[PDB]
Amino acid sequence: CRFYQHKFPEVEDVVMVNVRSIAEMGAYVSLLEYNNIEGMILLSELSRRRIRSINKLIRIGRNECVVVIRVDKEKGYIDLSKRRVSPEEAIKCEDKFTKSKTVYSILRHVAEVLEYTKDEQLESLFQRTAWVFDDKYKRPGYGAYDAFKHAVSDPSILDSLDLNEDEREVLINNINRRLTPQAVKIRADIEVACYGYEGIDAVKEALRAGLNCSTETMPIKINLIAPPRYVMTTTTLERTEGLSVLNQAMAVIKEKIEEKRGVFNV
Amino acid sequence: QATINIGTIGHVAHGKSTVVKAISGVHTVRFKNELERNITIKLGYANAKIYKLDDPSCPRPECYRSCGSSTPDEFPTDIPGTKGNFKLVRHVSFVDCPGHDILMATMLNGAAVMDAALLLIAGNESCPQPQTSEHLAAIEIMKLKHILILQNKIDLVKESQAKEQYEQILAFVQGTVAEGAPIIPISAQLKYNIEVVCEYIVKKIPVPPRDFTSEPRLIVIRSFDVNKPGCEVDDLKGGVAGGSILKGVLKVGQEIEVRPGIVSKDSEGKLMCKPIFSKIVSLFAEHNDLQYAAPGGLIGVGTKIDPTLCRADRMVGQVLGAVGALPEIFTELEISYFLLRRLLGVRTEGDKKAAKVQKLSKNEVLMVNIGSLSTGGRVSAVKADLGKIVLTNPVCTEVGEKIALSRRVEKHWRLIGWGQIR
RNA sequence: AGCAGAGUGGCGCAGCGGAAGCGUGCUGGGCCCAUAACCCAGAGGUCGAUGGAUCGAAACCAUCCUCUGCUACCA
Numbered sequence: 076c077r078f079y080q081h082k083f084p085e086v087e088d089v090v091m092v093n094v095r096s097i098a099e100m101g102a103y104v105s106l107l108e109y110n111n112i113e114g115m116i117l118l119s120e121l122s123r124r125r126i127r128s129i130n131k132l133i134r135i136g137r138n139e140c141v142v143v144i145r146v147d148k149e150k151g152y153i154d155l156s157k158r159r160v161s162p163e164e165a166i167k168c169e170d171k172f173t174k175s176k177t178v179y180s181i182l183r184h185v186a187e188v189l190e191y192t193k194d195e196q197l198e199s200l201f202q203r204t205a206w207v208f209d210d211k212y213k214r215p216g217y218g219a220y221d222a223f224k225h226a227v228s229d230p231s232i233l234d235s236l237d238l239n240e241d242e243r244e245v246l247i248n249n250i251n252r253r254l255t256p257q258a259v260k261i262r263a264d265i266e267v268a269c270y271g272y273e274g275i276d277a278v279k280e281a282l283r284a285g286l287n288c289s290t291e292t293m294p295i296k297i298n299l300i301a302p303p304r305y306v307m308t309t310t311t312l313e314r315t316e317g318l319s320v321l322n323q324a325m326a327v328i329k330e331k332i333e334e335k336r337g338v339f340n341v
Numbered sequence: 342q343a344t345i346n347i348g349t350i351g352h353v354a355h356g357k358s359t360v361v362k363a364i365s366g367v368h369t370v371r372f373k374n375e376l377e378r379n380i381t382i383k384l385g386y387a388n389a390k391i392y393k394l395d396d397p398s399c400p401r402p403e404c405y406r407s408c409g410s411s412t413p414d415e416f417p418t419d420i421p422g423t424k425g426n427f428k429l430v431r432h433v434s435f436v437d438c439p440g441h442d443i444l445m446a447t448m449l450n451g452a453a454v455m456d457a458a459l460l461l462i463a464g465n466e467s468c469p470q471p472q473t474s475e476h477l478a479a480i481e482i483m484k485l486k487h488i489l490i491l492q493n494k495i496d497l498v499k500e501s502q503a504k505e506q507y508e509q510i511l512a513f514v515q516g517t518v519a520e521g522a523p524i525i526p527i528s529a530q531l532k533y534n535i536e537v538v539c540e541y542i543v544k545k546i547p548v549p550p551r552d553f554t555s556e557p558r559l560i561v562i563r564s565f566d567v568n569k570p571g572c573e574v575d576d577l578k579g580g581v582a583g584g585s586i587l588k589g590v591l592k593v594g595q596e597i598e599v600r601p602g603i604v605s606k607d608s609e610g611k612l613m614c615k616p617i618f619s620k621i622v623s624l625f626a627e628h629n630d631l632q633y634a635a636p637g638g639l640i641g642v643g644t645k646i647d648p649t650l651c652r653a654d655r656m657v658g659q660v661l662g663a664v665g666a667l668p669e670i671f672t673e674l675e676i677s678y679f680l681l682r683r684l685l686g687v688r689t690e691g692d693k694k695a696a697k698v699q700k701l702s703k704n705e706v707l708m709v710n711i712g713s714l715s716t717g718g719r720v721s722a723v724k725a726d727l728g729k730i731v732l733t734n735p736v737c738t739e740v741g742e743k744i745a746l747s748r749r750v751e752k753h754w755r756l757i758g759w760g761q762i763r
Numbered sequence: 764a765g766c767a768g769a770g771u772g773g774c775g776c777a778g779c780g781g782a783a784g785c786g787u788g789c790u791g792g793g794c795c796c797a798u799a800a801c802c803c804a805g806a807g808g809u810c811g812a813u814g815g816a817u818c819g820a821a822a823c824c825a826u827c828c829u830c831u832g833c834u835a836c837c838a
Contacts, residue, residue, distance in 0.1 A: 272650060
């Protein structure tokens with residue numbers, strides 16, 4: 076269904092719909108943030124200015140970041156807006172939906188990992204996994220609480236979503252299989268250009284301690300890519316571990332080269 | 342190791358690759374590789390093991406025949422002898438001096454540490470050729486006369502056009518020792534007469550009288566860094582200070598300085614400098630390890646200076662004497678000099694611009710090639726035979742052998758004469 | 764050499780496991796008496812290779828291939 080505990084969009088709900096088929100006045104477009112729920116567009120008000128064209132190679136299957144004017148919770152008609160849109164840029168909701176496709180797809184087998192998909196007991200599948208985040212206040216809350224889950228190695232088996240199978244055969248591999256987590260590896264450049272004949276040994280000395288501080292606390296691999304330049308590529312999985320790799324590198328470059336009186340750039 | 346240093350010196354459009362590999366077999370290479378437009382403008386190194394088969398050729402390590410690869414038109418077949426585990430006569434070293442008119446100064450620095458020269462003449466350009474007037478008279482001042490005039494590009498140039506040039510270049514170096522220099526017509530296409538030329542680089546060029554027991558006077562003209570990009574932390578090394586030693590045998594583990602050195606911190610005037618002392622890590626012999634650096638040869642002297650002190654060729658013209666070296670460090674300099682009546686190093690078919698040069702004026706920068714060093718300085722008080730120049734860097738005269746003074750009459754400084762250190 | 768980027772339709776070039784993308788060139792019809800301007804339709808996919816972890820990579824993930832660049836040369 077959807078990973079939203081709420082069924083329907085609300086008033087002025089900026090929603091991401093799916094352009095299935097173009098119809099007479101417009102297109103019966105179906106939401107995907109909320110399950111599959113149909114909405115409508117033009118005749119009335121979607122466009123703002125007049126240039127009189129709609130498509131050149133744009134075939135089918137588009138998604139429209141549109142704002143709910145009218146919603147019929149009983150009858151089933153969701154009137155949508157883009158003429159009102161000065162600030163509701165399409166990039167933010169789709170990239171949220173690019174997450175929220177995977178945020179849903181993580182939380183809809185589940186059904187200890189095969190995965191299947193489809194189907195388990197669909198509503199009870201989400202109260203245990205998908206809507207229990209949406210129950211977990213607030214809505215900016217489970218923007219991070221779900222992100223706490225698919226930051227998988229930071230950590231895996233912590234705070235609840237201890238529901239329901241146990242969950243944990245999914246929570247190890249199927250989170251990594253459904254999300255396929257991406258993509259950050261932070262390069263960390265240290266260019267130490269000493270020009271005399273004294274402080275250039277301190278470049279090598281802070282490289283010597285740069286190995287040692289990468290050996291003691293074990294950050295990864297302070298390298299030499301050039302005689303002035305010490306560049307490491309810090310893989311980051313905890314969203315804060317790359318700074319601890321970098322700041323222990325900068326502490327060596329700042330102080331050990333100052334001991335033998337050289338200059339640096341970092 | 343090495344006992345001699347022969348300069349492969351020659352003017353524009355004669356080819357350097359087919360002739361230096363014919364006499365050595367080891368190619369002179371540096372950056373921009375992307376190699377070279379016409380002839381090698383860098384001060385490159387070349388080292389080889391010349392020998393004989395009771396036959397005055399320099400044979401290849403496959404010493405049955407010498408079938409070179411300088412052309413595919415005719416198969417160059419000389420007979421250097423036969424196999425049979427050849428007898429090693431000596432070890433030959435080369436100093437590849439630059440041969441363009443723009444790089445006359447770095448030519449003078451690398452040739453000031455060598456022991457011998459070759460004059461590599463193209464038959465292409467004008468028969469009163471300027472660099473043959475330039476180089477030979479410059480060789481005359483740097484206490485060298487070991488010259489082999491080697492007319493290098495006469496393969497398309499006919500025997501009567503080649504006839505005019507070596508006569509007319511010798512007609513202008515008539516005040517220079519080049520008459521004891523044999524004029525050898527060879528082929529840069531058929532690699533021809535190298536069995537006769539490598540006789541002459543043994544015959545005309547023997548082992549010079551070289552100070553073995555003296556203090557080590559290395560003068561580096563080429564910097565080399567074994568601390569290349571891609572190195573590591575536990576791969577810590579020094580910087581290779583590779584130049585020709587003109588005096589004194591040098592050993593591995595010797596604490597060597599660069600005696601002209603670097604300006605010290607907060608020099609409000611001109612007179613404060615410190616040599617950079619360094620222990621020598623290794624000594625190179627053409628492919629081979631040694632503990633000795635027998636001078637009169639281009640010797641790779643790997644020292645314990647820092648990676649930045651060799652990451653570029655920053656030691657061009659530096660007296661690297663040992664720890665506690667005697668020769669002084671001058672940043673202001675009293676020179677005695679003579680001005681040559683021909684502006685030497687530039688002459689065309691209309692004889693431009695070798696006319697008489699206006700005298701040196703004070704507060705004017707002039708390149709001084711002191712010993713083998715590459716520095717520039719302005720003259721403070723200029724007389725007829727009393728020059729008082731102040732240098733931007735404290736430079737060391739290895740000995741008061743010679744200086745080469747040039748005046749900026751064009752885009753590059755051009756040779757107006759020579760002189761000596763008072 | 765270590766280093767930094769890309770590889771994707773003919774091109775420009777989207778893209779990140781429930782996807783081979785548009786923008787241009789490209790061909791026919793529509794429209795008109797016709798052109799221009801334009802509409803509809805046709806044609807253009809090794810996502811470099813290898814593929815695997817995989818429910819299924821283009822992606823993820825690596826490797827090598829190509830291009831772009833570097834200390835500027837490293838006895």
